[PDB]
Amino acid sequence: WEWNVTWNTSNPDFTKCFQNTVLVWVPCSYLWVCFPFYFLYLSHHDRGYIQMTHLNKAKTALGFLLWIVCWADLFYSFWLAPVFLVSPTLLGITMLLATFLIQIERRRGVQSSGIMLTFWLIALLCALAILRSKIMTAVFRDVTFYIYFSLVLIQLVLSCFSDRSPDPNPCPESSASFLSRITFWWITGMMVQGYRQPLESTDLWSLNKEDTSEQVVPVLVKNWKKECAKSDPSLFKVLYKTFGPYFLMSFLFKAVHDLMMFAGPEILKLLINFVNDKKAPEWQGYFYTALLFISACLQTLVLHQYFHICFVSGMRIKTAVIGAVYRKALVITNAARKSSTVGEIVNLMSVDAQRFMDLATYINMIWSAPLQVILALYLLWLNLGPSVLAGVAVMVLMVPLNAVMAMKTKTYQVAHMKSKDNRIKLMNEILNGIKVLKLYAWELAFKDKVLAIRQEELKVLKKSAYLAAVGTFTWVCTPFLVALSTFAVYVTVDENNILDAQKAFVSLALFNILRFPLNILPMVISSIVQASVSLKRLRVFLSHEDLDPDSIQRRPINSITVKNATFTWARNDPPTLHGITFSVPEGSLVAVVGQVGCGKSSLLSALLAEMDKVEGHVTVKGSVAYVPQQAWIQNISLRENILFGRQLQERYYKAVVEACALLPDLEILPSGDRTEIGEKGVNLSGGQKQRVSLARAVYCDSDVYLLDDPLSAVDAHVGKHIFENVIGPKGLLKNKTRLLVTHAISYLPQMDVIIVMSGGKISEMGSYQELLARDGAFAEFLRTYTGQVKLSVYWDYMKAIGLFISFLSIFLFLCNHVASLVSNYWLSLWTDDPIVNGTQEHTQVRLSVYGALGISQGITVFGYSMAVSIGGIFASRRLHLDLLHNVLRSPISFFERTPSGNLVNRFSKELDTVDSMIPQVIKMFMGSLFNVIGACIIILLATPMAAVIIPPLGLIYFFVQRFYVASSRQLKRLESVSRSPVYSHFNETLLGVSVIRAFEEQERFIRQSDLKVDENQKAYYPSIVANRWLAVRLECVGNCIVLFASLFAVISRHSLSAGLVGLSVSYSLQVTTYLNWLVRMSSEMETNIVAVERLKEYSETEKEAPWQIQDMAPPKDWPQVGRVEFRDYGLRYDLVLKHINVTIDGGEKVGIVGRTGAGKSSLTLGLFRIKESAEGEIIIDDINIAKIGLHDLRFKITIIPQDPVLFSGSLRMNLDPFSQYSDEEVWTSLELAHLKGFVSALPDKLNHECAEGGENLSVGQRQLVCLARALLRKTKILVLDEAETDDLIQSTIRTQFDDCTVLTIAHRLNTIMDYTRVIVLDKGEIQEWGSPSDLL
Ligand SMILES: N[C@@H](CCC(=O)N[C@@H](CSSC[C@H](NC(=O)CC[C@H](N)C(=O)O)C(=O)NCC(=O)O)C(=O)NCC(=O)O)C(=O)O
């Protein structure tokens, strides 16, 4: 090895000894170090054995022949040089290891191999080098090498093909070749499929076998139970032993990528030397630029497996954490669950498990970032002098800044959240009582409150804009900041230190590399600290006490046996059932009897192993069907609620439904039994749910029934019918053991056994007649009583943000990326000045200009981040104002036609992506667009010839960008829609834990939850593979431009001054990272800009008549006497109201009677103009209603609706939201409403904080509060809508409102009889018009 023939000549030939030693030791050596390690994977991972195919044999036979040929050399050598013995034998032995390896790989089922491909590639390259040398030298030993090379080439070609393999849509990962598994080509079929036709959930491939929940949840369960047995228990230790072997391969892929990333600056330093050093062989530059393409492209292929491993491991964590929490939630004791809120347990997957997946992306960087920093600091310390310390200074000041900034954000980040949270419940209230809200004209009153809370959160967002501005400045200007400090302290520390390209552009490339680790380490630290509390919560939940599975003896088919059993609701709390004993025989009806808080429901809970048994013996025999007091309704259809995951039997189902008297309920419900009952679907009355729960229990066909007050909410006739056909000895369950908790005597004599208790103690149980004869405790008890988003949407967002702010940001950021190219061009000029006297003559002026330009870069980066977030706040406030005004200035018809969920989602999620997502995405997309365009301008300007690569790369970028957008706009949309159902189902199962554990349907629910999370993963996994595909394809576009920006800089080195080449290559090096973010953010932006369109949709719908006309406004005393006249009124809805010509005189009490389907209520809607008059001229006194603005009439007429809607806040804000009426008037009205005694009782006086809908207040109180509102209004026209306190409200409406004209729509004739001039509506027509005396 000497430089004359290898380096310094025009024919770069390797020496003969080098050829025969190192070029042969490289490949053989590769297989020898990998072979042992490869058994680990081959053994731990197995997939069967591949059959005998021609390909596998072809490879094995060539491996045999190759070994022979290599040993044939040893034979000829045996037939002087020491290398002519060891090298052929070593090659033969490693070849024998190669053929054995394909053999064992066949045995272990590996269709495509990575080691058996890279090894042949390395051998091929080594053979190619020797081949070229041997063909340039020119029989004896050469022909053996030609045979070796041809066989190696054919072996390499064979190794590319994938062997035969050992539901449809199987994940192509299982059937993909290794060469296509690094380029992620197996998803390309989806990509094109994403552009031609939209993707549904039916086309996503089935989750691969390992990631499925049944494979990753049981392993975590086993590892956690093992740790608990070890007993103190830590989840981090269990998470390690579970997800550590897979995450361990991330270290190898990360470490190689880190080392290969810093090869860029080193090869750049060599290339700057080659350009600067003349008379050097040309081929040297071609070799140097070839190493810039192989190293930075292999870096892409090795980095986009670290990311894949980290993402797959995080997704596995999210799948296993969700399943483990779900499986633990079904065995947790009640006392333990009291310590955790229901919604907080759902947070264990909604945010807690998501935090682990988010962490897993960058968790492996807490060591890579310090390693990148240390290695870079070592490299640049050699590049320049000890000035690194100065740059280190800028680094040791920048990192703490980020740190505190991150912390600060987090705190008020949470603040923002809670503010939004508050608003959202308020928003719900407006969507709840919208009808009563528009009846009294409270729209303006509540719009002000929503605007106030909006301003409250907008101040926090405004501050966080400042914190994001410094975060972006530290992301962009930190590499420059370090560069400026280092260059300044280097060039001015003395006079013998100069700045040439090899000392400037290499350091610049290192600083560009160093930017990411410094600016992402604080985020990683914040994420780890945030996950430190998520881990604590997860461990706390998973370490709760488990339910005793043997406490109740569940013997399969004296039916229920309890002796000396005392139960508790908690370990330390006193017993609730003391010393209970009773024996319920098979097929007997037993009624639990007691007062409130006696311990009746506790008995049924204890028979289900819900109570904590401190002592005793319980031997419930056979299956148990539980009808809980609080009915648990699944959001599935009513049919599946009754079925409860059981085979449908038409005769049995149709015998159960009417026996519960569910036929009228089926009739009223829209779809019948297929209607979607539950909280999300149609709401059901308490009695209806009681029947449904009972119907489900009856269908379940258990032998033991525990009916914890099934007839509480059903009426007396319905209850008696139910008992007759279901629980009665002559019902459907004649031969079923029934144990019922009741407080109604009506069915007691029919009960076989009555268990009467007092204070959780058995008290003289027995049969009804015997207990009555005994005259004891029972006698006492009885005596007790889709396409591409339009640019018009972008223009709409620009109009909302403001043209001034929109154009100022673009101009000021173009200024940022113009002062950046010129500053780097100033460095190009600086590194090309004469070096006369060993001192840069113009060091002062050039350093000052560079620093001033960079400071100009420090005012424009902070200027475009302060003009995109401020604009974001300004646009969000305008969008919220417009949406609120549109919604509040619209009639009630679309409120029925448009579901409330849509509007609440628009007010919740849509406003979140406009203020907290769009400003960040637009700062990065626009930040990366000119980063690319500006980088391509320097490359093109330095070497014009680099323009014929622009056409071929433009097509690749266009076709990759279009496919990725068209396919990933839908995949994360399919993932978002499938994420909420998992949390919803977990909430549902948490609500009904006791029912699930009683019916013993735990396995079905556990499998449903894992199927739903599997459906979520089915959309999440293609989403993370799409990013890898996009990056890999566009990295090699930014990688081949590195080759071409340096190739044209090598062929034209003569017409270059070693001042542009380093600049061009340095800028091309950062093209790769900024190009995959231009496209990722071009896809997020499209799915984020659709929020503006969905937030502006209601700006184009029919609105109500103007609230204030102000041209034909009525006088202050508009209802002078209150003379109402319906002149040929007709209300469209075909006409519910028709031919209505009636006259209600001023101060004359008038009521409206009619059956269901008449226009009684619709008549009130006529008075308040809720629905526009199809044909009618209602006039109050001498003024037409249709001409008057809505608010005016709605203020001058009052209504007391069916169910009074009390809004959250104080009672005074309920009575007078505008606070227009004085405190004395409020007090007088409240006293006149029979409420003075109660309203004076609250500690908060008039400021009593009533919850959503006035849950704390009683129904009677809420009704009297609505009456107080009407009384405080002091208007001459009042309408009443009648459905205990009836005597009070009727007397109050008859007390002082005799002066005012009162219309009354009552479903009860008793009250209407008092009112004169009763109007009767048959089908909208006036059937009778006269006083009740003329009625009879
Ligand atoms: N040197 C790194 C290179 C990392 C790399 O090349 N890939 C980056 C791309 S820049 S990822 C960096 C990015 N930061 C920003 O771009 C924000 C900058 C500033 N806040 C502003 O507003 O301007 C960020 O926060 N990202 C987090 C996210 O994805 O949400 C990555 O993390 N890829 C993630 C992926 O592909 O999924 C390494 O060691 O590998």
UniProtKB/Swiss-Prot annotation:
The ABC transporter domain, residue ranges: 560-784, 1124-1336
Coiled-coil spans in chain: none
Catalysis: reaction(s): ATP + H2O + xenobioticSide 1 = ADP + phosphate + xenobioticSide 2; an S-substituted glutathione(in) + ATP + H2O = an S-substituted glutathione(out) + ADP + phosphate + H(+); sphing-4-enine 1-phosphate(in) + ATP + H2O = sphing-4-enine 1-phosphate(out) + ADP + phosphate + H(+); leukotriene C4(in) + ATP + H2O = leukotriene C4(out) + ADP + phosphate + H(+)
Keywords in alphabetical order: ATP-binding, Cell membrane, Glycoprotein, Hydrolase, Lipid transport, Membrane, Nucleotide-binding, Phosphoprotein, Repeat, Translocase, Transmembrane, Transmembrane helix, Transport
A Gene Ontology BP annotation from the UniProt entry: xenobiotic transport
Pfam families xrefs: ABC_membrane (PF00664), ABC_tran (PF00005), TMD0_ABC (PF24357)
Activity regulation (record text): MK 571 inhibits sphingosine 1-phosphate and leukotriene C4 export.
Listed PROSITE patterns: ABC_TM1F, ABC_TRANSPORTER_1, ABC_TRANSPORTER_2
Tissue-wise expression: Expressed in heart, spleen, lung, kidney, skeletal muscle, mammary gland and weaker in brain and liver.
Annotated localization: Cell membrane; Basolateral cell membrane
Membrane disposition: Multi-pass membrane protein
Entry's EC annotation: 7.6.2.2, 7.6.2.3
Start and end residues of each ABC transmembrane type-1 domain: 247-530, 806-1087
Residues in the Extracellular compartment per record: 260-285, 384-386, 491-512, 820-856, 942, 1056-1057
GO cellular component, one term: basolateral plasma membrane
All ranges on the Cytoplasmic side of the membrane: 40-59, 100-111, 164-238, 307-362, 408-469, 534-798, 878-920, 964-1034, 1079-1336
Residues that bear N6-succinyllysine: 425
Family label: Belongs to the ABC transporter superfamily. ABCC family. Conjugate transporter (TC 3.A.1.208) subfamily.
NCBIfam families for the chain: MRP_assoc_pro
Protein name: Multidrug resistance-associated protein 1
Species of origin: Bos taurus (Bovine)
